[PDB]
């Protein structure tokens, strides 16, 4: 709504939170890719897509309820009801990717990198996902290359999440 609110929001976040938000806003940033999160917020504001509900949605998707209550004077229930009523800006596929990436270990992601380096030509799971998307191998409609890869590393728990998402969308 105002420049100082978004400036405070950008100042109060963390580098990992900034990177996660930048990845999560990839779908809406197809036309222009802001290198900085402040640039992304400015672009969203200039296009009118940065609203109170939208900002609440992004802040809720990064689990920062303290900033939600301290700035927007809103709680979890209100933003959840807004999500239920108002349409979601970002597809739940990105939310699933972020949730999966939040749980993998550094050794696990290194093993995943070693396994998947055959197809492709330090790196976090989000970097691997975006690089794979650049190579057009995993898409919001195809997830076998991820389900099988996750099952191969003996982390069968996230296969349940992937299949639950796949069943839910259809």
């Amino acid at each position: 709504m105002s420049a100082e609110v978004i400036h405070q929001v950008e100042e109060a976040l963390d580098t990992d939170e900034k990177e996660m938000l930048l990845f999560l806003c990839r779908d809406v940033a197809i036309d222009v890719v802001p290198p900085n999160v402040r640039d992304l917020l400015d672009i969203l504001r200039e296009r009118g897509k940065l609203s109170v509900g939208d900002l609440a949605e992004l802040l809720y998707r990064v689990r920062r309820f303290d900033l939600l209550k301290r700035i927007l004077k809103m709680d979890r229930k209100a933003v959840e009801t807004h999500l239920l009523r108002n349409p979601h800006l970002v597809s739940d596929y990105r939310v699933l990717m972020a949730e999966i990436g939040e749980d993998l270990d550094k050794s696990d992601v290194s093993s995943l990198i070693f396994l998947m380096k055959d197809y492709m030509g330090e790196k976090s799971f989000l970097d691997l996902v975006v690089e794979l998307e650049k190579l057009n191998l995993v898409a919001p409609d195809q997830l076998d290359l991820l389900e099988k890869c996750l099952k191969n590393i003996h982390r069968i728990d996230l296969k349940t999440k992937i299949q639950k998402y796949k069943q839910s969308v259809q």
Partner: protein, 182 residues
């Protein structure tokens, strides 16, 4: 009702020896690399939770593990299961998630005293010669070491029988009871 609280209470009743026994019994479902840093039951419970073998809806593996190490107190204090129910459940084929080989080896380990242990260690030098002659090696560790060098296996039980016949006879009875399945 708190699943995590029940798991923590179960894990707080296990000392180092029972932890080592639990680690050996579930060796099939967790590789040795992931099994090195396990120092308390909480890490093992988390590792089993990763592979979808232990959760709020499905407890069919924890009960079996607690039954095999003869910790029947926890089966009734926390999980609310009597001995007869577990015996009947294990009697039905297809619900034994642990092969009879591991439980047979564990029973042989339990049925050996300290003097029998040192006699077994001394007599083991016939075939595998000697890697290191420290007496600190428990029977479970020695069994794993012998399994690594394909000295002892599912179909290869001659060495175990030969060494055991020199010490006791009830071990031969256990081995024959296991062989009766085949």
């Amino acid at each position: 009702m708190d699943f995590s609280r029940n798991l923590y209470d179960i894990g707080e009743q296990l000392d180092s020896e029972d932890l080592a026994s639990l680690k050996f019994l579930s060796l099939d479902y967790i590789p040795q690399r992931k099994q090195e840093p396990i120092k308390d039951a909480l890490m093992l419970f988390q590792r089993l939770q990763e592979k979808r073998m232990l959760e709020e809806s499905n407890l069919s593996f924890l009960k079996e593990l607690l039954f095999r190490i003869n910790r029947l107190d926890l089966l009734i204090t926390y999980l609310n299961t009597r001995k007869e129910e577990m015996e009947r459940e294990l009697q039905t084929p297809g619900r034994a998630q642990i092969s009879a080989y591991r439980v047979m080896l564990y029973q042989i380990s339990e049925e050996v005293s300290r003097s029998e242990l040192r006699s077994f260690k001394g007599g083991l030098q016939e075939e595998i010669s000697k890697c290191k002659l420290d007496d600190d090696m428990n029977l479970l560790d020695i069994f794993i070491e012998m399994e690594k060098r394909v000295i002892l296996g599912e179909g290869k039980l001659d060495i175990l029988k030969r060494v055991c016949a020199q010490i006791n006879k009830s071990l031969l009875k256990i081995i024959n009871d296991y062989e009766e399945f085949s």
